[PDB]
Design a protein around this ligand. Sequence first.
Ligand SMILES: CCCCCCCC/C=C/CCCCCCCC(=O)OC[C@H](COP(=O)(O)OCCN)OC(=O)CCCCCCCCCCCCCCC
Ligand SMILES: Nc1ncnc2c1ncn2[C@@H]1O[C@H](COP(=O)(O)OP(=O)(O)CP(=O)(O)O)[C@@H](O)[C@H]1O
Ligand SMILES: [K+]
Ligand SMILES: [K+]
Ligand SMILES: [Mg+2]
Lengths: 557, 673, 188, 27
Amino acid sequence: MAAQGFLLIATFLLVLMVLARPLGSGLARLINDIPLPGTTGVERVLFRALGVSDREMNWKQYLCAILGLNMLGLAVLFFMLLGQHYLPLNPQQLPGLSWDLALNTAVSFVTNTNWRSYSGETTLSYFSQMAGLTVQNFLSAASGIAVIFALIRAFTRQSMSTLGNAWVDLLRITLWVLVPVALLIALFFIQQGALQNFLPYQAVNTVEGAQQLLPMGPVASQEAIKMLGTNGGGFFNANSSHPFENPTALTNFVQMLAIFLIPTALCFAFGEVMGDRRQGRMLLWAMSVIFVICVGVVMWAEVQGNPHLLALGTDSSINMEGKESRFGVLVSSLFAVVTTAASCGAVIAMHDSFTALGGMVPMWLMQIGEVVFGGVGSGLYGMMLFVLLAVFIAGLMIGRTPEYLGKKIDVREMKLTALAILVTPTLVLMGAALAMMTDAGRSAMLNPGPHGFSEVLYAVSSAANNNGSAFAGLSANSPFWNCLLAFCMFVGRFGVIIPVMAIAGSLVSKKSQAASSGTLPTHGPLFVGLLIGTVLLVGALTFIPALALGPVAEYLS
Amino acid sequence: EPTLVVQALKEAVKKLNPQAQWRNPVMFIVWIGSLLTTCISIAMASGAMPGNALFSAAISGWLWITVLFANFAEALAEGRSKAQANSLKGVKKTAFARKLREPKYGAAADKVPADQLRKGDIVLVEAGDIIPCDGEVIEGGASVDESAITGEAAPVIRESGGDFASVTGGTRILSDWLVIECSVNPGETFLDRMIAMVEGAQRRKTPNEIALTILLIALTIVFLLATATLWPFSAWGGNAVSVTVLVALLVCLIPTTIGGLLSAIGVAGMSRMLGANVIATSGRAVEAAGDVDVLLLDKTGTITLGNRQASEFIPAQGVDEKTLADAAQLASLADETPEGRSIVILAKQRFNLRERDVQSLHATFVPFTAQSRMSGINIDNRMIRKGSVDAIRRHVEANGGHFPTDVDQKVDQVARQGATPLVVVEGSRVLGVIALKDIVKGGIKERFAQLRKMGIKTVMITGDNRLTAAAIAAEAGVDDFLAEATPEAKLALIRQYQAEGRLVAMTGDGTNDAPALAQADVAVAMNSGTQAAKEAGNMVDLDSNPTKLIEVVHIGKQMLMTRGSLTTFSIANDVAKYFAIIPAAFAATYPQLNALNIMCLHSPDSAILSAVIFNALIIVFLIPLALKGVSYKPLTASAMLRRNLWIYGLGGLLVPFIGIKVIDLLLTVCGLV
Amino acid sequence: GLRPALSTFIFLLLITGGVYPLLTTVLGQWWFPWQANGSLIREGDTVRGSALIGQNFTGNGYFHGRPSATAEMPYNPQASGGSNLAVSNPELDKLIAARVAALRAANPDASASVPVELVTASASGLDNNITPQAAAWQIPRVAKARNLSVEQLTQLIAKYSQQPLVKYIGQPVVNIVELNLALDKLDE
Amino acid sequence: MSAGVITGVLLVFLLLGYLVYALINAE
Ligand SMILES: CCCCCCCC/C=C/CCCCCCCC(=O)OC[C@H](COP(=O)(O)OCCN)OC(=O)CCCCCCCCCCCCCCC
Ligand SMILES: Nc1ncnc2c1ncn2[C@@H]1O[C@H](COP(=O)(O)OP(=O)(O)CP(=O)(O)O)[C@@H](O)[C@H]1O
Ligand SMILES: [K+]
Ligand SMILES: [K+]
Ligand SMILES: [Mg+2]
């Protein structure tokens, strides 16, 4: 089993890099405002028709463009969900969402969380899932990728004042990186058993004579984009464990590869745009180390399973409870760590049922900040926040001014990165305290004991970190929970993107020094381990007391 | 010393006011935590709250000791700085001053208080008296003793109309008299600059300091939220943890170690700087000095002793030695620079015939200028010049004269010997060359051997001949040099280096290099230097040895080293302190967590006590580390990071484990808890 | 300058929301109509279920699947829920004990050790897959129920199995719906 | 929401505001 699990991790990472470097080169071309081969002819007219005039934007204009697009996105999705009944492709005559559910869902998909407090086969219609959630999957992924595009531009450009064009970046990303890749993935899912149609719900007269109403809908399109853009927005209650959303283990493998594809490609593109592949390799090396160790811990924990199963007279202690038969325990453990490390949110195995340790590590991969192959864009600039912090403490220790890629990091940049690192954990801790202090927040706990607090903490932490995973036992359809999580998600995403764009704006203006003798090389196992320890110490010391009363307490019980 | 420890302790007690602590947020959170825990203690002892009162009293008391030890570190540093300032202030006292009526020497002088001196006055100082104020020498030449300002009993020459005409107030003259003019006002003298460097209430935080403080604040916010939100979590899990234990956990997790020691590190840095004979107006330049990769030296006065003396006169062809020395003496009369004075002295010892009066010659004096790089006299229908090789070549070419080949050969030979060769021309015929040899100052070459070890390159900017520049370059053991460089070229070199993203540091002395000094980011202004140079240089060296920047770099590095290392230490410390508080704070809510206690402490009360006691005592145990800095060794970046992390990153993990266990065992043996 | 912001949003809205799913649906219905329609199993005019979604089997003569904690009744696609009960939650122990007792009472000619797959619920609750070992455990029950030989029953279990390409990306699984329907075929 | 928790949350909020203000500033 251990051998099997190691083989699975190795194959996953191997195929991941093999697919990541090509797309990394293409994304690098987009980062340098160099059109893709053969697309220049059509971009000329598309931008001419839309009004995007390749006019450079500063960090203020760029941030305002991204924010404006997301604002209009959530306004449109909010009203679409409210007026869900007055819209076409309504095979099931269901009512529009309430104000709280509409608000939470709109903020969930715009904010690239896709947190869900509903059942997508009962609640949402085909139009909301097609023109409301899928569109926001694309646009949210594109917003995150545009933010990291501008940050990488700030690192590579010399004494400039602009960060490119936000409209050009969004258009190019969503038309050539997200639409065709997701099209390829969606067609593959359809061929392996996914659902892509606009029929009404089918009636099954079961073999043994029961009535089973089968849900239909365009599931493959949303599945390709929810996995590629690390949205995690499931078409049904069961997110990626539904046989229609994830029919075979082959689709599951491709889904995990899709979750990590763009983040890895954006690291390769980061290394290639800066003119030093060692930097991208360094960044990936660190994220891969933490990822592999976490997968190993979760795998072993779930293999250890539940002692009560063996005491009650089963074959083994293997914790199948919140697992599927298609994917083994090892596959489910890997997917748990993948979806919670990449900020995807796609849960193929009910995390509430995982072992205490098994659910601890995913929780803690969200809480650290989603910096381990993190969200699409989100993960890389979170990790860049953590890199700045590491470079600071490193150059501080060696007696030289903080310098990363030759850009000196000074006071103002330090304020910005500190505030950005504080946004997420502040939300986690404050929201969890608010939930555990109100009767409406505690009543949602399905499992008693420490695991109930673990549910609350996991929910708020996933929301604040834009992951979207949830223990799924906590009932968050209440208005209090909807509003709390909506606030947490909104602040997480946008209050982290604002200071990141300020970092970019402050970094374009600076110049980059050459590689002097004393310049600390940020590439290599020394700095790799320094970055790992930075993220891990700060991550542990922030959430150890919270994790102590939740998963650790349940483990030692 | 005992006096400075008791005095700093008294000052630490006096700094307990919240107004004093408002400026340091790290320790301000500790102050407020300590306040609410002593408030809880007094209230619960009175009978207004449940639970044990002596435990809260002990915890709050040790938190008060935490803030007291932080202020003790800060106060001890400031006290050790203030004492040095006291000594220098005592040296500042002057007996009296004597001002003359006319600028010429020999006029009537009257006794006037030294304090009454103002800018523009002309004061005379004879053998025995001390300099009343700073300024520049206008008449006379003598050797003054700068032991009062540098602590070295070695004498130094001071002549008028030259690069060595800068006098410092407080020195003592004993070999002859000097007439100086005080161009400084009361309160702006060089002696008061040292007080400005040492005295507090005007030493703002450095950029790096502010960035690190931002980091500590960020962490403090993190831990504040963690501990503050621990109350509702545990409250749902059962009996809520006591606010006393939460404050203990907060102050333990807060970077109180570096929080308290940060101010002390800065102050100690500036004390060590003064102790190394360097006057740095601001720590910012000292910190920037750590990132310097190219050193810009001055050949004369910085790598060489200065005041080069003439040795011999060499004729070229069809020119008697008498005519050459006579013309050189006449041309040097208008040159108040040490070069001209030495030329005249050599002519004296060689012939010593006749006397010169400007009225008897009816010719205006041509002063020496750095731009002209030549001086001379204009007698009746006669133009006589004397300057460098290129300068004399330009003039003789402008006058339709050619340079003899043997003249060039002799100049090349003298330059190969290492002496700055000067050429003198009468009308349209070159008389010959003068030998202006000089002594190297300090064990420079040996020092640069290890200067280059840490990546600092040395470039000697020189206005002499290529070969003489190359010669001293060799004796100096500098990396590269420049030949026939004017002041604008020196500045241009810094422009070139500063565009490549390389901080340039200028160790120079004369007025000629003043603007280049100012342009460079880091600088070392030699005390054997002019007031314009000093004011324009961030650091003023007193030993006047070009390798003082070595010391500077050592200090600046150390400062940043200590900062970052203590940070690594503090965060590592948090891990162990978790293992002490976590199983203890929730011993009554989740007994299962008691197995999570790995240190095997005695009791929850005692575990939290040991945590707080360690948090307090590790500031005192790091006080000497903060004052002396981190004795780092000259390594590369990756190896230096490796060493700093191996020591402090792992120390901050292992030290608290063993220390908490050691304190818990002491409490367990003493039977306190 | 909101003209680009509105034009870009509407253009990407139309593309990603109308052309992307329209193109995906056209190509899906063109190339893979069966899978795109849900892989339905039809016997005449009535739909007997899907080859991915799992029905609730309680008969003695059919192969039993994993329990489903899905809303009102087990194996209900409308709810698609899983049994979120944690390890420490005693309700999960209660359910596991009751399920072990039920399977042991219904499977007297099997081993006391019950396969962990049949006692623990699934993630989606619509799990139509059990490992060949689990399905093989309940062989004698079905064999006695339908008077089928243990050899051809094993061969049938082996026919409707599905093994991934590589052994470590999933587990061998048996389609319970197709297996039970083929069992009905064979009985006729 | 007793008096103890009211003043506790208030103090936490006040110290958080103090720390954030000091972080934004270069005091
Ligand atoms: C947990 C607390 C404190 C943790 C302190 C642990 C670090 C102690 C360092 C020991 C290393 C001694 C090795 C002995 C020599 C062996 C020879 C060799 O092969 O060296 C190979 C490399 C040398 O790097 P390099 O290639 O040479 O450098 C040129 C590439 N730029 O060593 C390595 O594996 C690198 C492994 C070190 C990474 C572990 C760092 C953990 C996190 C640090 C703490 C962060 C603080 C948080 C900030 C708020
Ligand atoms: N009083 C004087 N009379 C004639 N020539 C002089 C002179 N003083 C200096 N020179 C010439 O000017 C040349 C270069 O002058 P410059 O000041 O630029 O270098 P320097 O050696 O005199 C001071 P440094 O080299 O430390 O900057 C000297 O080497 C000498 O040849
Ligand atoms: K997400
Ligand atoms: K989900
Ligand atoms: Mg000079």
